[PDB]
Amino acid sequence: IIKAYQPKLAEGNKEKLGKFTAVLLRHIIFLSNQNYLKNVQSFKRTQNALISILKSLSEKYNRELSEECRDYINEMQARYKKNHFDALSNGDLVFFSIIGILFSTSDQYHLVITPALILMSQFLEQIKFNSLKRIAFGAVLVRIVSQYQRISKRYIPEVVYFFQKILLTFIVKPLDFENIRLDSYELGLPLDVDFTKKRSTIIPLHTLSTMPVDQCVSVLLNVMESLDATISTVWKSLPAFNEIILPIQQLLSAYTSKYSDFEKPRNILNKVEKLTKFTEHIPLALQNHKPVSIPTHAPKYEENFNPKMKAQLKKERKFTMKEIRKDAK
Amino acid sequence: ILLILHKRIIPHFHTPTKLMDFLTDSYNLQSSNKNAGVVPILALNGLFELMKRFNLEYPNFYMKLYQIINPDLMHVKYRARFFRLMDVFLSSTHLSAHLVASFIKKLARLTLESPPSAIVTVIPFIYNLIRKHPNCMIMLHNPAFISNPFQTPDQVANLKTLKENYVDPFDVHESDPELTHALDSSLWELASLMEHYHPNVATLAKIFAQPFKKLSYNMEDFLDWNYDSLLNAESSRKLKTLPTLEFEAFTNVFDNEGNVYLPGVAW
Amino acid sequence: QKALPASLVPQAPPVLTSKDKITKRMIVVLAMASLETHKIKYVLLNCDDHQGLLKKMGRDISEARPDITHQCLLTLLDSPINKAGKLQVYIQTSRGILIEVNPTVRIPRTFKRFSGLMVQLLHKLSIRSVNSEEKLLKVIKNPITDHLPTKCRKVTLSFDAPVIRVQDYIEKLDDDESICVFVGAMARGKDNFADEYVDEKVGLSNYPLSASVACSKFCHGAEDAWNIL
Amino acid sequence: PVLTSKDKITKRMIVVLAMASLETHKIKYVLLNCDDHQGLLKKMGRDISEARPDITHQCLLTLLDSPINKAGKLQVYIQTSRGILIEVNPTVRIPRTFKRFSGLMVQLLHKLSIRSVEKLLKVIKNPITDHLPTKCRKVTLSFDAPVIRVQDYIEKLDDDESICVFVGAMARGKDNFADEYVDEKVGLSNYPLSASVACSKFCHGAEDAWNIL
Amino acid sequence: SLVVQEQGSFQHILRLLNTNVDGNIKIVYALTTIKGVGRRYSNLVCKKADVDLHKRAGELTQEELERIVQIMQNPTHYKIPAWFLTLANNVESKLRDDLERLKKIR
């Protein structure tokens, strides 16, 4: 289609291809919604290829793509308004990922990223995450948002809130964490879980629709890896790192006591101890402002000084007036 | 009932004083049902109307109030109603620096794990409090720790020892807002909010590093914000900017089961 | 331990004025300034531009260089001490005219415009701001001393005088008093223009110093001495 | 001894007057000026705001007349905004009046050198780095950069080395002219400083640091 | 510990009729800053508002300020009295002509 309708071939091909850019994005998202567990390979060979074509289309048809991308965000919000999580689908997760491919994620303001980030922060929070399907959906969401800030490394409070409830959810309460609001108490992992077998931490998208303990563990393992990565990159830089990590530290302590064999929390805990030791937690001082100068004001002057019209009439009267007496005299 | 009690019920009763025991019991409700944990928030409004109208009292009001502030407050849809009442209570002229300092430090602590909508509420709310009670500038900044180029080498050595020996004295578990030692602490939490992902929120947090020229901010311009309003607002932006791209290229958006955009995520 | 100021916003330090004598400040007198006007249009008489006319006036053109005066005020006015509002500037024209330079002023950098300002000050006796709020340059009544602070130290620039460290000189000096420095804007002449008012004459460097250079050295000296930065 | 670009071992103050607005325009070639030549510069398409060779003029007066130059410990380089590098011999004595000062540079820019009967002013080939001493510290004046004591800076700094200060004579512009050559930028005062004032501020510190007096 | 004053806190600044009036200044001479409002007109408005003139502009309670707004916007309704609410170049040329004729006399 692109070759048949290149801009040079005819006038008006640019708008057709630009409209086609919007059309192609919906198809890429559309295919992900369709079931593909049967021919995951063939889907993988179509899905990535179509993204590459959009990348070429985006390079010249950005405005068409950006308009469509914003439209999907509004549609996603509208569907979330009535269906809540039921609106959310695999293609929705895919859609955010493609925006990351094609658009500059780490900007203070962007047309599509700034909406896209706040949509995911929404999904990170009001979504109750009371099902392993929903928790896995959030785990994918955490990875997407964490990468949008791979360079900015800005602070997302929802990531902090999301981790705490998910971390506590799998130990259900221990009676020492009443400040964290859980939405499910039946997802607590069994004590018999080995936590020494090599369980794959990769979460396939297609498994999400199908969705036990290993699935619970696999979802849990990925979340810490996101948690551990964020500590090293974002939270470490923040001035309030200690306050951010204290509730996480307490939750991580629960894993080690309950599951001694489980090593991931201990590695994070050992790392967290290292960061707090080096960081010098000193009272901030931000109101130290540079002194202000005395006022400076420009002089008022005429470039060529002279040592309204009614006033001149008066002076010329006086001169003309004055002369008259001397003749009269 | 509690939501409409203050407005559509009290003014129409002949002897509204009869409601207090219902309201005080409501304000003192503690239950294992989490959905009942919001009851003191709603009951507070009706209780204050009775106290205002007939000069009626609730014991240890601020100490009970300090307890009600919790992370759940930042996420309930009734957050906006609560803070409006907080403005009135914390506008009192007989409030000690320590009492105000505790409300400051706890709220800043809660903002770390708060929705931006709540953060948008707190950042002006705190500026009003700090402005009202000037003694609390210690928590934003303490001049003792500032370094001057002119300071002698001995002063440099003394300053170094002071930095080493500092410890945060603020206690999170103390329920008496006068004893938390917040005034001796600092608001590291607000500084982190300067790096908030949302640009407009970060600019609000940036205000604390700026001179406190403004006298106050209208809370009602800040209270009833939801993400959907943030979504409607960004779409209805006054200024339109050209979209930008990523020169960096990823071969695969998702990881397998060359360049992978989302390692740890596969189809 | 002390409670902080209620408002921490930086506020401009007060603009020093002749009426106030208590405050510590650095005074500098640009003596022997050659500022003269004459109708051709009244132009600030210049050593190079108007050589024949000054010959007709009979005044030696060598001492007809207002550029030296202009340069001194430029480095003086733009010094940090002025911007910090602990410096006020006095100019004694060679004819005998005393001028006040309000620290707030911002003169033009181009000399041609500066000549435009000087002719007017001599004629109107004053200069008013663009916003019309304060009189930047004002001619005043001699002698200088009444305008000088009540407790004050006076020094002149003499190449022959012993060389002294300005930082040391200010540091050893008291705090309630004030310091005047008499700088000779004249290109060449005997350093006795301010002998009658000064109590002692000091040198800054073994090598000869220009008026613009010498004052700039001193203002630094006070700024390091006073922790002005 | 008169310091020269050829000699690199000796410790000295180098001052680089960057972004110098020195240009000759023929309607006869004359130095372009903000006020004298407004319409002509408009025809050239160049904004009149950054058309002040006087700012460069004042800086040379204070630099050349500084006692450190009299001590033979200072050499000046000028980077014209057009991209012309000019070496200023420490022995030169430029005219005090700006008109005569403009009259010299038209000869320099066209004749590429000024001779007395050593080149007092000579146009040199870029980059500026080659002329600089082999072991040398480089800094720019940056209002945004932290404020430092110039005296302490020279004191803490080594002796066999030399220090370069890149002064931007241009009225208003981003302080990135010398970002390529410099290794750090330093603030001199919390307050604004004019180019003439700033380089005057630096030279005294060198005078105090080395006791040139 | 809980004291709330009905009248309200002192206001350093107020906004009235799209103009920032310094609450510091007295009411009459804070309102005179309002364009079209003079000292005497401001006095008239203040007295009709039943607002004591000795008060500062900061202290004002809401209802009286709203009353003042109503007074200004609706003067006639509250019975404010109505009374309270080239050729030269030609003459120059003629003078010049007379001057020229006068020169002609001589």
């Binding site: - | 407005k7 209208n218 009833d224 | 033009p108 | 009225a171 004019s194 | 004002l60 809401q62």
Partner: peptide, 25 residues
């Protein structure tokens, strides 16, 4: 409630540097 206090708060609400040249005219 807010419409009421929204009315109330409405009453409540309300240098040359370096080498900068004086405004040319």
């Amino acid at each position: 409630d807010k419409k009421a206090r929204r009315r109330t708060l409405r009453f409540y609400t309300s240098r040359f540097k370096g080498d900068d040249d004086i405004p040319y005219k």
